[PDB]
């Protein structure tokens, strides 16, 4: 009765094998393209999320090379502050910056948010980000038509979708680049509570695919926890990569440094949840993540992974990297193989913790 | 030598695949079928469980929409009485009532006890649930004929089953309904203490199968820890739901609240149990639950996740989410990503704990 | 380049289905074939260490039905003594007696020991059980013959061995059982030191369809921890089960009742352990396991068990039980889901702990 | 879009089979061979680790039949004298020495490094080990050539490798032996870091099937638990092991002694930790490994696991031993049953820890 489409495969279930390699890790290009017409020079976004990502978090991600999305957790006129103040901010050489030397940054909207949408054009946001629960609906379709009726010439993101089909329907309505990511967050509780997602690797896989057909990339939101997690999400075919959890512990995202017994912690939690909604039904929760100093620091570990493994794949940029990669699938006892394991960690690794 | 007929998946080994969608989760419609003659506004019903079910937790089931079905762990008198007191009792539109008003109520019964089955008939019980061990028998097989030849017209649920076997043998002597679990409940111990079980994903979808050829909806009993498993046990085709742990912990059920080491619990317990049946061999363990206060509220999160995964697969009503869904399979990797995961929980969600 | 011949199940990679039942768990037979010429009441056999047999542990499980095998860790002469009193020794219908009325025993030999096997013989013993650590050799099976030049008509058990090529050699050389088991016992090293061994579900499936072909019974010893293990082991087409832990922390196993941090205890260990042996390169250890009582409780706990089985399956006797079972393959979210899960068990069933 | 090539396991997935054996356990004999043209009494090899490595330790491998690989995190001058004081270094029959009566011994060079090779030849290493982090590489091939073209008769040994493609292009260049890895080790990190590596297992299934057209060895280097784990990587067809942290808690790996909370400790660290490296992305880590004695006791518990795994087999020699073995497929459950379950360990074992 019931129709099983597909075993689907997360992260930690595969491998990148390693290939011959004339590249050495320090001279990799790691340049990638964010949306169809807005290039990054390194292939990092962090999350549209009110613990995460604000005026400060992302000046630092264009400043290294990226972008960062201003949540939309605000009302529109301090929204529009936080991009002016983005816009109007080297020892920086790969800054990413739009055509006239302000840094590039985008923010997040919602379904019939019009005014918001104005208001952030007149600011001059280089792309506007536009969140669902679930991107393949008429409500986000409709609205990708609005927008891009009105303003042709607007970047426009849209998500999130976990199904080639849906990627097709965004594709089709002219959307510039698509968010992948049903569930795998660390701080989203969708897939427990409403039965619903596509676990990570296959879903990027199935919508990379799809989206390659209208020369449309694919950003994977949510699931990283370790560097190579992005080299994997790239090596597949995804064009960048969204991090939260990762970046909510560094100074630059919202909210001060507490200690608790005797560590140091930011908290963080998930936009679905009570405490960033304020009877509702969540999706997400709160929490705390360990303090990681500054997001230059968190950045250059997580590149350092990934041109590390661009390094064992033999690849000299992104997609020759996505052409190169061949993966193996892996057991349980593999991935414990994987990790550190039969030692007690006496001093912790600056990129690979607990 | 060894005849394995087939390899069986639970709640937590599959997900189901988000679709298009023009539904919104508040507008979709919930109501389905308890029996093929008495039909549910929401999908759940409380378990038949003496820590569970009494006259204050069934009638609260029904003012919401639902049924309750009181435990038979008592002497005929009180379970009349018990039965009596929910049909003699708006704010509750959604009530489910029988033709003159009232609200609706389940009992069980045992195999050989006509004399009880004659005093519920008396009070009105809507309808009686035989509950065994193994359905799939000639006691229960032969009850189920000797109440039908003398109550044509009393709606009867046979359980519990775990194969199409079964399905067919029930429906064919002529029973209104079906209940498919054998081993997945919180407080059962029968699938390690003798061997036996399907797990339930697999038997609800071997069950509804056969089911459909007679008509008989399937209600799938035991193994439900979030509000997603109910989604995707409707999905794969079963009717209604029963939830045992999951109400245990609330006011209406039976037993008082305690504090132990600062949280709050009410006692629960398998009917096989030795504290339910006062040398015997149980297939039950006696425990505690976290006190989560009113039905209304633990059932307002259930239906909450129900209606968010009907918008994610775009059905507008049970069936319609019957047809629409489509599931993939996934790795013990996949369920860790759609947990919480590195993240520490500071303020615990209405709907998902630890 | 490396050869795999099959991927290989365990216990708890399975489970029993539900058939059509006209049988009670109290009306079942559970008698049952030791050796191809003698009987058990009941199918369990106490295992040959000096941690769970000896004279009072074979009285009582030759007393309720079935056999209780004297380890060797010791003289001739107490061996010899040993038996004697068993022998020498109503309220106990079932009992398994020989020929003139006296409880039989077994005990244990190993190779190149005729002295051993001449006066055991003189003593009695009903079946002598010739344990190697590696059955499938030419020490094990040249013993085998001397054994049966000299005594044609003493029953004899060698193990263990867990291939089929391995019964087809011990049954041409003439054994009346195979003992099936390398790795699973509870205290045994010998998979993780060496690297061999065969999970036990596989190994008594293969070891059954060959002995099958010489009407050679096969006792599968180790790796118990429930009692729906013993049912599993039974249906896939074992006679007997041989049991070391559930046993060990009886009134009746040597050794002695000690408490350590409120909890009761007996000391229970492998023969292969420094601490049984007294370099030396061990393949058991030395532990302790949970104080649970009589013999008698624990058996009647463990047969209610298997009666409750072959009620669900529908099996009159354990060879109805064996023609009608069918299996199926679960996964690790469905083993969790036959546990207890969700509750925190309060009052510790007699049949399921921790 | 993704291409996945293999399902790949490592040891834990698999067990070996017992066959029929006319072999005793201190009958077989376990020498192999190093590299092509050097041998070795016993198939160990330590690591090449500034915590397990130097001279002390390799007197203790060489005495006892295998070898130490003298680790590069020092200058010249002093690996030369480590060198020179194993050379110059009964109750040691197996002893490994070259054709003076000298002990055998190696050390680790890195590319670019002609001038640490001309120096380590005049102190009369017998083999050097080219090891970098990613074997098949331009890097590491190009100086696999400059070393053969200047010192065709030196043995030299390049790694690490994890594919078939890298086992023919080091093999291509010419070198003596290959060593597979990437990832498996302890403490590395490599695979969760940067997403790359290949499970052990399957690693060195792949590489022996390719080199073994050279007629070149293949030394399994990292992911040693326990001493079955060596039984199976010879088994695979791998010729030889390096190991790790097993050696590294012993009086001969360099650090000293200390005690931490009652236990006893050595130190142990991946070579690309910071601390060993003393901004940079490390791939390894730094802790503490529980003392266990001398080598030579380590070395007799690891070797009697190879001989009792030899025994069950029925293998006389180490070649035999691949020839004859073969291999099942096992689940989680079956790895628990493998283990020590079910009972609480007293009296710890010199052979099965934790
Ligand atoms: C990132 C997530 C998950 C998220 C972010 C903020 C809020 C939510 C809340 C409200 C908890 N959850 C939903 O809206 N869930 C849902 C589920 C299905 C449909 Cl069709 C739907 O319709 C779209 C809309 O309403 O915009 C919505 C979730
Ligand atoms: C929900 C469960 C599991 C349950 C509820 C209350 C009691 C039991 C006890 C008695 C522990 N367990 C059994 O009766 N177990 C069993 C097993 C096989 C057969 Cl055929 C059987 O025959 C039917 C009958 O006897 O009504 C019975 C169990
Ligand atoms: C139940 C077990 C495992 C067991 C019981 C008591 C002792 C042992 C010790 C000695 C630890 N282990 C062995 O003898 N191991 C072994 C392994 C292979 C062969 Cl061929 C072999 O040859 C037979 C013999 O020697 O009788 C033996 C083990
Ligand atoms: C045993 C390991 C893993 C190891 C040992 C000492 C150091 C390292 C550090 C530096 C952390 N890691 C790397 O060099 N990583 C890497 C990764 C890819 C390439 Cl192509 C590469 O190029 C070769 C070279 O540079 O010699 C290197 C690692
Ligand atoms: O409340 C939520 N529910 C589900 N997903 C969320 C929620 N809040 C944020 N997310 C998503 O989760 C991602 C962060 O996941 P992380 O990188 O694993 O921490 C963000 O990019 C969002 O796409
Ligand atoms: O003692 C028992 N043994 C086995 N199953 C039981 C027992 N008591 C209740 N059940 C079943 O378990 C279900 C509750 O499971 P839960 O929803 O997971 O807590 C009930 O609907 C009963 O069908
Ligand atoms: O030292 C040992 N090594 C391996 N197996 C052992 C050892 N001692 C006893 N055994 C076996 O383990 C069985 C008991 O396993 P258990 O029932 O799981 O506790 C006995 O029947 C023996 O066959
Ligand atoms: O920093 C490192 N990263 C990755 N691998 C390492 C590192 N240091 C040593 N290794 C490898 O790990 C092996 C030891 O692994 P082990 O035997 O599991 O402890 C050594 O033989 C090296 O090949
Ligand atoms: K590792
Ligand atoms: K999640
Ligand atoms: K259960
Ligand atoms: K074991």
Redesign the pocket.
Same mark, same amino acid.
């Given at each position: 009765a019931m129709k099983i489409v597909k075993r689907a495969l997360t992260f930690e279930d595969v491998l990148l094998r390693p290939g011959y390699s004339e590249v050495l890790p320090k001279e990799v290009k790691i340049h990638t393209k964010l949306t169809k017409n807005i290039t990054l020079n390194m292939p990092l976004i962090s999350?549209?999320?009110d613990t995460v990502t604000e005026h400060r978090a992302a000046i630092m991600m264009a400043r290294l090379g990226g972008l960062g999305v201003i949540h939309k957790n605000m009302d529109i006129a301090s929204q529009v502050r936080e991009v002016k103040r983005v816009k109007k901010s080297k020892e920086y050489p790969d800054a990413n910056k739009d055509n006239f030397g302000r840094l590039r940054v985008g923010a997040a909207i919602g379904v019939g948010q019009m005014d918001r949408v104005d208001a952030l054009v007149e600011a001059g946001v280089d792309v506007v980000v536009l969140?669902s629960?679930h991107g393949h609906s008429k409500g986000i379709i409709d609205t990708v038509k609005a927008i891009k009726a009105k303003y042709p010439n607007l970047d426009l993101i849209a998500?999130?979708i976990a199904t080639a089909a849906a990627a097709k329907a965004l594709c089709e309505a002219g959307v510039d680049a698509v968010?992948v990511?049903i %569930?795998? +967050? *660390?701080?989203?509780?969708?897939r427990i509570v409403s039965g619903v997602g596509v676990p990570q690797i296959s879903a990027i896989d199935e919508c990379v695919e799809e989206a390659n057909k209208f020369g449309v990339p694919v950003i994977a939101?949510?699931?990283?926890?370790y560097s190579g997690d992005i080299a994997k999400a790239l090596a597949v075919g995804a064009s960048s990569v969204?991090?939260?959890?990762?970046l909510?512990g560094t100074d630059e995202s919202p909210g001060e440094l507490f200690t608790y017994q005797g560590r140091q912690y930011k908290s963080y939690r %998930?936009? +679905? *949840?009570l405490g960033?909604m304020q009877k509702l039904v969540?999706?997400?929760i709160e929490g705390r993540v360990p303090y990681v100093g500054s997001i230059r620091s968190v950045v250059h570990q997580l590149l350092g992974g990934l041109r590390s493994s661009m390094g064992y794949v033999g690849a000299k940029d992104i997609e020759d990297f996505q052409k190169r990669a061949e993966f193996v699938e892996i057991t349980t006892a593999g991935l414990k193989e994987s990790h550190v394991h039969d030692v007690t960690i006496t001093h912790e690794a600056p990129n690979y913790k607990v």
């Open positions: 999350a549209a999320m969140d629960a998500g999130n968010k990511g %569930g795998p +967050g *660390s701080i989203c509780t969708t939101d949510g699931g990283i926890k969204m991090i939260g959890s990762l909510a %998930g936009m +679905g *949840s960033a969540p999706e997400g």
